[PDB]
């Protein structure tokens, strides 16, 4: 037998945006071999990533503290008669986490503020696993009508649970805010105003009635729509 070498291409991620890539385990593991996916030189993955061994998906949602380059090892091992894991091969690639998505899914003119809908949640992303972060985005899709990968999810900063610049807004179900808070947002369009915003009853009504929080799994503090400086 002559060993095969598999190269995996490097990836990119953006703070506050879902990350998902397929790992070619069928090329790396000959039949009956055990796959391990970890940070290079460690047993665990970085805190922002999760490995699904049955779908062969590496997925995550980075925070600002995850900015920079993450080396990931994908290795295959033979289980010995004595239960030992005998390493057979390893493939290492990196993922660079960038700081800013500029509220753009990818489309607005550089002359143009982005109209963003934001939902404020009583949650702490730093207390949530990567899978919990992704599941929260998944559960917002019924309300946003935006795909998982086009929503943004970041912590509240400097304890601000409101945006005075918002030209539309409304309440959620929460009466108290126990955690630091999280901001889950998406783009509605470019330099919109109240008359050109789409129908948002599908956000505002479930938010106030508690149906949104019951689906998301976290209390909803409120929602607002504001135009944000282009970047
Ligand atoms: Cl940010």
Numbering used by the authors: 58 to 163, 179 to 303
Q: Would you copy out the relevant sentences from the publication that reported this structure?
A:
Dystroglycan (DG) is composed of two subunits, α and β, that are formed from a unique precursor which undergoes a proteolytic event within the endoplasmic reticulum during the first steps of its maturation pathway. The DG main role is to bind with high-affinity laminins that are central organizers of the molecular network behind specialized basement membranes surrounding skeletal muscle.
Interestingly, the human T192M mutation (and its topological murine counterpart, T190M, which causes a similar dystrophic phenotype in a mouse model), lies within the strand B1 that together with the strands B2, B3, B4 and B5, arranged in an anti-parallel topology, defines the floor of the basket shaped S6-like domain. The overall structure of T190M does not show global differences with respect to WT. As reported for WT, the structure of T190M consists of two domains: the first one described as an Ig-like domain (residues 60–158) and the second one (residues 180–303) similar to the small subunit ribosomal protein S6. Despite showing very similar crystal structures, WT and T190M differ in the conformation of the flexible loop linking the two domains (residues 159–179). Moreover, in T190M the loop could be traced for three additional residues, up to Gln163, with respect to the WT structure, with residues (158–161) assuming a β-Turn structure. WAT304 acts as hydrogen bonds donor towards residues Val188 (O) and His296 (O) and as hydrogen bonds acceptor from Thr190 (Oγ1) and His296 (Nδ1). Such hydrogen bonds are not observed in T190M due to the lack of a bridging solvent molecule that would stabilize the interaction between the B1 and B5 β-strands. The plot of the emission spectra peaks as a function of GdnHCl reveals a cooperative unfolding behaviour for both WT and T190M, with transition midpoints (Gdn50%, i.e. the denaturant concentration inducing 50% of the total peak shift) of 1.45M and 1M, respectively, indicating that WT is more stable than T190M.
